[model samples]
Target chain A: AELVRDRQELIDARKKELKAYMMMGVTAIKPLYDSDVNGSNKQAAKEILKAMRFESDGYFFAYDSQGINTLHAIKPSLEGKNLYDLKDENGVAVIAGLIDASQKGDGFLYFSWHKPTINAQAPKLGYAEYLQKWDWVLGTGIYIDDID
Target chain B: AELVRDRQELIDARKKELKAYMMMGVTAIKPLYDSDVNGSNKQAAKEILKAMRFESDGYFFAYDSQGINTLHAIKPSLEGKNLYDLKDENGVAVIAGLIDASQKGDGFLYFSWHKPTINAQAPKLGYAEYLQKWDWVLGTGIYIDDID
Candidate 1:
C-alpha cells in the first residue's frame, strides 16, 4: 500500500543519516591517524573514537586488515578478538565482508549481528571506510529493524 | 584549521542527508500524483505533503512551473505567493534558481533564507526535484547555520 512506500522513504532517509554520521567520524579521525606514521597519534584517534556513537546503541567499530577487532565502542571485550573467521548465524562471512567493503573505498555490508539493546541477532546495515595508512577499517552499523 | 575540514565532511554529509529526504518525498508522492492525471490524485499528494517536516526547522516547500508557491509546510501564508522575482540578501534569484535546479532533475540551491527558529535570514541549502508531470517543483531546505 501507499503506507509501505511512505515508510520506505523514512527508512532511506534514516540510512542516509547514518552514512553521514559515519563519514563524519572518518573525516574527523583521518588527520589524527595521519599525524604520525605508527605512533601515539593513532592511539589518540582510537582514544577519541572510543566515545563516539549516535542514536541509541549505535557505535563505531574498527578492525585491522587481518580481521582482528581493533576497536569496538559498544563491546570493548571484543577489542582484541580476531574475527577473520567470524560468521553470522546465517554463515555470512561477517568480518571478511566488512574488510572487503572497507577496501572498496565506499564500504557497505549487510549481515545479522547482535543488537546490544535487543540482545539478539538482527539484520544490520554496515558502512565502513578503510584507513590504508594504518590498515584499519573504521566502520559503524545500524539495525534496520530499529527503524520501524 | 583542522576543525574547518572536519566540519566540511559533516556539511557534505548533511547535504547528502537532505538529498535523500528530498528523494524520499519525491518517491512517496510520485505514485499518488501518477494515479490520475490533473485531478484529485494531485491534490491528495499535496494534502499528504502538507505536514512533512524534519529536524528542528526543516520543512518541505513546493512551487509550480510558473513560480507560484503551491506548498509551504511552515508558511501557509506563502502558499499562493508568486516568487519568480524573489532574491536573497545577496541578490541571488531564489525562486528562479530553485526552478532551474528542479527542472534540471536534481536541484540544489544555496541562498540565505529566513530561519523561523532564529527569526533571521540565514544561509540555507535547498534540495528540490521536478515533478514534470504536474509542473510542480517539490522541495525542502535546511538552514546550514543550524548545523553548528
Candidate 2:
C-alpha cells in the first residue's frame, strides 16, 4: 500500500507539470497565431512559430482546422500531411480533438507516443488550442510517465 | 463564457498536476524517512527533505501527525510550529486536511492565497499524503489562476 501510494503521488505531479507546460505552449502560440492572422507576413510567421520550440522534451506543434499538419518541430515529415484521422494508442482521435479544442478556444488531451529522443513509447499529455483567426490549432505535449 | 472556460480549464489542470507533484514529494521523502527511522540520521533526513524543491513555484511542505509545521520550503521559520487550526482564505482548514489526507493514504485540496511569484491572490490546489513511518503530512500547491 505504501509503495503504491508513493508512485501514484509522483504520477499526479507529472500530470500537473505537463498540463501547466502545455498551457505554456497555448500562451506562446497565441501571439504568433495573432500575428500570422492579422499581419501580412504569412511565410515569416510560419517560419517563426515552427522554430519557436521551447525545451528538449517540450515543443510546439501546428495543424489546420481540417486536421492537416502544418508544422512540427522535430517531425517535419508530418508537415503537409492530413492526419485528421490519426488515432492514438487508446483510439483517441488526436487531430480531431485538437481541432475541436481550438474551435472552442483551447483544450488538452493525452495519448501514448513514441518520443524521438527516447526512441520508445511513453505516455504523453498534450495541450492545444485553436486559432480562430487563422483556423489553426497549436500546442505541445509532455511525456508524463517518464520521470527520468 | 471564454473567461469562465479558461479559468475552469486552468483549475482542472492544476488539480491533476498537484496530485502528481505531491506524489513525487511523497515518493522522494519515503526513502529518507525510512533511513531516518532506522538510523541516526534523523535531523539530516529532515533537513534534506526540507531543502527539496521542484519547478519555479514548486516546493514541499510538511506537518507532523499533530498538525505541527515541520518543514516548509519558503518559510523556514514555519518549522517546529503548530498550524493545525490554520484556515485558508476560504476558511477551509488547510493543515487539518493535509493531515487527514496523509492518514487516509493520500489526497488533494484547494484554497485561495497570494502567489508571491505573480504578486497576486489566486485559487490554489494542493496534494498531500501521510507518512506512516514518520507521522508526517507532506504536500505541494499550485496557483492555478496564475497560469497566465
**lDDT digits (tens) for residues A35-103 of candidate 1:** 676666776567545655554466778999899998887788998899999999889998999999878
- Which ten-residue region of model 1 chain A has the weakest summed lDDT? A23-32
Residues B33-81 of candidate 1: C-alpha lDDT, one tens digit per residue = 6576666677656654654445546667889888899887667899889
The CA lDDT of each predicted structure is 0.75, 0.65
Q: Model 1 chain B, poorest ten-residue lDDT window? A: B47-56
Clashing pairs in 1: none
Q: Could you say which candidate leads in TM-score?
A: 1
For model 1, what TM-score is found for chain B? 0.88
Residue-level lDDT of model 2, residues A3-80, one tens digit each, is 878767766665555555444333323344455636554444454445433345666678888888877867889988
Regions more than 4 Å wrong, model 1? A1-122, A125-148, B146-148
What TM-score would each prediction reach against the true structure? 0.52, 0.47
Alpha carbon deviation, residue A9, candidate 1 (Å): 24
Looking at model 1, residue B70 earns an lDDT score of: 89
